[PDB]
Every structure is written in C-alpha cells, then in structure tokens.
Design a protein around this ligand. Structure first.
Ligand SMILES: N=C(N)c1ccc(CNC(=O)[C@@H]2CCCN2C(=O)[C@H](N)CC2CCCCC2)cc1
Ligand SMILES: CC(=O)N[C@@H]1[C@@H](O)[C@H](O)[C@@H](CO)O[C@H]1O
Ligand code: NA
Ligand code: NA
Lengths: 250, 29, 12
C-alpha cells in the first residue's frame, strides 16, 4: 500500500495472508468470508506468464495478523488448504478478467477479536455503494512504493472512479468485472495498492446497516500511485453467482 | 459466519469507531 | 529473515 497508514488493531479482522511454505514468504493478501472459505485473486494462484501455478500443499493461510513478518503467537491462526477453486473464465492470457479464486480450509477457523468474516454484497448494496466518488478501503502488506515493505498491515481509503476515466487511463481492455479507484491528479490526496497487496479486499461500510462489505479484490495496476493511473479491482458482486455455486457445491 | 459478518469485535460490536471510517461515510452522498 | 519462522506443526 502506497501513502497509507498503519492499521489499528482489529481494524480488518477478515484480512488473510497467503503464505508460501518453502521458501517461507508472503505471496498475497486474501479475505475471510466464513469459517472455512477464503477469497483471493486468481493471479495469486495461477499466472502462467510468470510460471506461477500453485497447488494446495504449496501454501498456507495466516489469519488474524497485524505484523507482516512476526509470528503473532496466541493471536494469528495458521490454516492448511483443502482445495483451490479458480474462476473457469479467469483470463490470465489478456487482461486479468474475472480475477477471482476461492480457497477452502482443511478445518474451520475459530473467530476471535482478531479473526472475523467480511460480508459479500447483495445486488442493492452493490448498486447503492458502487458509485463514482464513494470511498472504499484497501488493506495489505505489499510494497510501500512502486520502486520498501511495512512492519504492520497498511490501510488506505480511496474513491471509486468514473468508468470512462478508468478506461481512458490505460491501454488495457477494461471489463464489467473490474472497477478502478484512486484520486485524480487535481485532487491532491494520493494512495494506491501495489505489488504484494494482490488478492486483498476493497471494503465499504454500509451506511444502511453499518456492516463492512467486500466490493473488490486487489487485481492490477500499472506501477503504483502514479498520477493519472488508478488501481483496478475485481468486481465481487458481478462474480458472486460463481462464488455461491462453488460454496453450495463444495 | 454470515449472520454476523462485517461487524468487527473491536469496533462495531463495542460501538467504537476506527480513526478513518468517517471519511467513507462522508463520501456516501 | 525476512519472516520469523512459523511453528513446525504447520509445515508437516
Ligand atoms: N497499483 C496497483 N493498484 C496494483 C499494482 C499491481 C498489483 C499486483 N498485480 C499484478 O502484479 C498483476 C499480476 C500480473 C501482472 N499484474 C499487473 O498488475 C501488471 N502491472 C499489469 C497487467 C499486465 C497483464 C495484463 C493486465 C494488466 C496490484 C495493484
Ligand atoms: C494454466 C495451467 O497451466 N494450469 C495448470 C493445470 O493445467 C494443471 O493440471 C495443474 C496441475 O497442478 O497446474 C496448473
Ligand atoms: Na483506454
Ligand atoms: Na494515481
């Protein structure tokens, strides 16, 4: 996260770290959506241009964390994966369309003050809140600048951007399964996700029921926090029928 | 835990506000 | 490290 701040304790209790077993290193962010399901970006698990194709036994999830590098004894919980599910129409070949994946845990995680699931949006919460200028919140342990890494989880609040501005900021083909967020050059304020924040959540707090909803997944960008560029996020509601099909079936 | 989703133990559950959530609310115009 | 080693139980 570029130009963010340290998270408060328990601020993002659905935060998940995807962790490589060997060598031991951070791979991505992710989010807790129930006691046994974690949501992330497909490119965290599968990206053939970079020879990335992880199996379940390659990975762990670490839940309840604040410090990036510490083993947070008596606070974090470490879970093994039963199964990875990648969207069948995830487009790693072109533009990261449908950049979404689910991971089922081998055993349910116990909730605590530090471990709690985020909600997924219904159609009406999504329609109400996915509007240009409305702000969401992105969290992660990724890079602090484009070109280094934080002691603790970082947080930044960023406005959703009008779709024509998103489209006109890039040569990549933008789809309805994406949205973009960030400040415009003339707005002064700054901030962005960055490499290492992949897979983490873009959340909004509903003013109707005062619950946090995950509207996006950190997906891609061109550099980090560049003027005139915006961060791109997987549109969770647009892909929710797939999420529900996987959870119902498996 | 769908029923209880999105309500943080250290914030909403105890009616405490984090330091920047108001910025989100003020944007929902 | 950069990462502190996690308990061996999680790597078995
Ligand atoms: N500033 C951000 N808000 C941001 C930046 C990077 C990330 C982490 N995400 C990535 O590395 C993804 C994975 C694959 C490459 N990539 C990028 O983002 C390429 N740079 C563009 C692709 C290049 C391929 C065609 C779509 C466009 C997450 C957030
Ligand atoms: C796009 C791609 O190469 N996907 C592969 C898949 O074909 C293979 O069956 C699997 C085995 O672990 O690894 C991944
Ligand atoms: Na364009
Ligand atoms: Na920017």
């Amino acid at each position: 996260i570029v130009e963010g701040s340290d998270a408060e304790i328990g601020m993002s209790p659905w935060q998940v770290m995807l962790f490589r077993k060997s060598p031991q290193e951070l791979l991505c962010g992710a989010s807790l959506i129930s006691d046994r399901w974690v949501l992330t970006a497909a490119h965290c698990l599968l990206y053939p241009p970079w020879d990335k194709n992880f199996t379940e036994n390659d990975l762990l999830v670490r839940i309840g964390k604040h410090s990036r590098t510490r083993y947070e004894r008596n606070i974090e919980k470490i879970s093994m994966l039963e199964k990875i599910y990648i969207h069948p129409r995830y487009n790693w070949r072109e533009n990261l369309d449908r950049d979404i994946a689910l991971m089922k845990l081998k055993k349910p995680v116990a909730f605590s003050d530090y471990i709690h699931p985020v909600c997924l949006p219904d159609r009406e919460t999504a329609a109400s809140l996915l509007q240009a200028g409305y702000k969401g919140r992105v969290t992660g342990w990724g890079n602090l600048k484009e070109t280094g890494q934080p002691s603790v989880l970082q947080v930044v609040n960023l406005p959703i951007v009008e779709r024509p501005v998103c489209k006109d900021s890039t040569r990549i083909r933008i789809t309805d399964n994406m949205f973009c967020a960030g400040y415009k050059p003339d707005e002064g304020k700054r901030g962005d996700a960055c490499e290492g924040d992949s897979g983490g959540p873009f959340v909004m707090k509903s003013p109707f029921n005062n619950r946090w909803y995950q509207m996006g997944i950190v997906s891609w960008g061109e550099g980090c926090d560049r003027d005139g560029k915006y961060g791109f996020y997987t549109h969770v509601f647009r892909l929710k029928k797939w999420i529900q099909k996987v959870i119902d079936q498996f | 835990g769908e029923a209880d989703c999105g309500l943080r133990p250290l914030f909403e559950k105890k009616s405490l506000e984090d330091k920047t959530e108001r910025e989100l609310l003020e944007s929902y115009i | 490290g950069d990462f502190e080693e996690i308990p061996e139980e999680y790597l078995q």
